Amino acid sequence: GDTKEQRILRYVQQNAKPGDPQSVLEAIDTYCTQKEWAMNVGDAKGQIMDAVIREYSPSLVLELGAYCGYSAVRMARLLQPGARLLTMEINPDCAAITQQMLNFAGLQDKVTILNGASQDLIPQLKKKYDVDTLDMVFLDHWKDRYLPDTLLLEECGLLRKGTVLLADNVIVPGTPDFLAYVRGSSSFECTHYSSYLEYMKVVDGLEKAIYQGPS
Ligand SMILES: Cc1nc(C)c(-c2cc(C(C)(C)c3ccccc3)n[nH]2)s1
Numbered sequence: 001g002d003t004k005e006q007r008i009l010r011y012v013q014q015n016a017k018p019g020d021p022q023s024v025l026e027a028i029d030t031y032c033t034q035k036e037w038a039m040n041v042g043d044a045k046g047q048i049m050d051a052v053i054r055e056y057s058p059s060l061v062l063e064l065g066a067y068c069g070y071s072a073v074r075m076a077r078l079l080q081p082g083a084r085l086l087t088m089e090i091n092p093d094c095a096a097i098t099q100q101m102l103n104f105a106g107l108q109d110k111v112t113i114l115n116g117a118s119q120d121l122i123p124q125l126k127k128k129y130d131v132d133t134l135d136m137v138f139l140d141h142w143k144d145r146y147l148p149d150t151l152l153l154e155e156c157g158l159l160r161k162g163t164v165l166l167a168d169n170v171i172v173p174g175t176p177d178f179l180a181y182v183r184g185s186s187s188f189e190c191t192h193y194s195s196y197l198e199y200m201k202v203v204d205g206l207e208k209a210i211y212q213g214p215s
């Protein structure tokens with residue numbers, strides 16, 4: 001049958017313009033509002049994501065949790081030429097949706113999709129994907145994995161001083177221990193950004209944590 005994710009791709013291909021990442025974002029935002037999917041990203045968190053990318057102008061971005069490719073499109077559209085986005089997706093069929101989504105948008109070149117679990121792929125980045133350090137990390141995958149994958153990104157030495165970690169949904173459904181760690185650690189300087197979830201009528205937020213070097 002035709003899945004929820006395929007319906008989303010299908011709508012984009014009908015109503016967006018190929019090679020125009022912004023129209024892809026509008027179309028997705030428009031569909032999610034029409035079908036009322038509680039998809040965490042909208043213009044609220046989108047503006048903050050855009051701002052974060054603009055301020056720090058990352059050469060290399062790691063995303064955890066590609067899903068349909070909304071976040072990847074939004075971020076990659078602001079990347080400089082020669083900059084890269086690496087997005088990790090554990091679900092093969094989502095990975096394929098994301099691919100097609102990035103390809104429609106004309107961003108297939110900037111973005112590399114890796115299928116597998118974060119804790120398996122992260123330790124391969126330096127050797128297999130010629131990564132030195134990362135400039136930015138967007139966490140949007142399984143919430144119980146935020147804290148262990150942050151610690152794994154430290155252990156592996158993928159963070160340098162000034163590397164930005166940006167984590168969505170830290171309040172809803174919540175990543176309480178992840179927060180406590182980065183806010184408590186001197187290795188991270190932290191800022192909280194608020195986003196009201198108007199479908200659920202409750203406050204959520206993003207956490208931005210800038211790695212300071214090791215303790
Ligand atoms: C240990 C993990 N590594 C990665 C890269 C993970 C991941 C999570 C996700 C979403 C789409 C959010 C997901 C996937 C399946 C069920 C629910 C939600 N995609 N990728 S989980």
Ligand SMILES: [Cl-]
Pocket residue numbers: 066067068069070071
């Ligand atoms: Cl998505």
Ligand code: NA
Pocket residue numbers: 182183184185186187188189190
């Ligand atoms: Na801190």
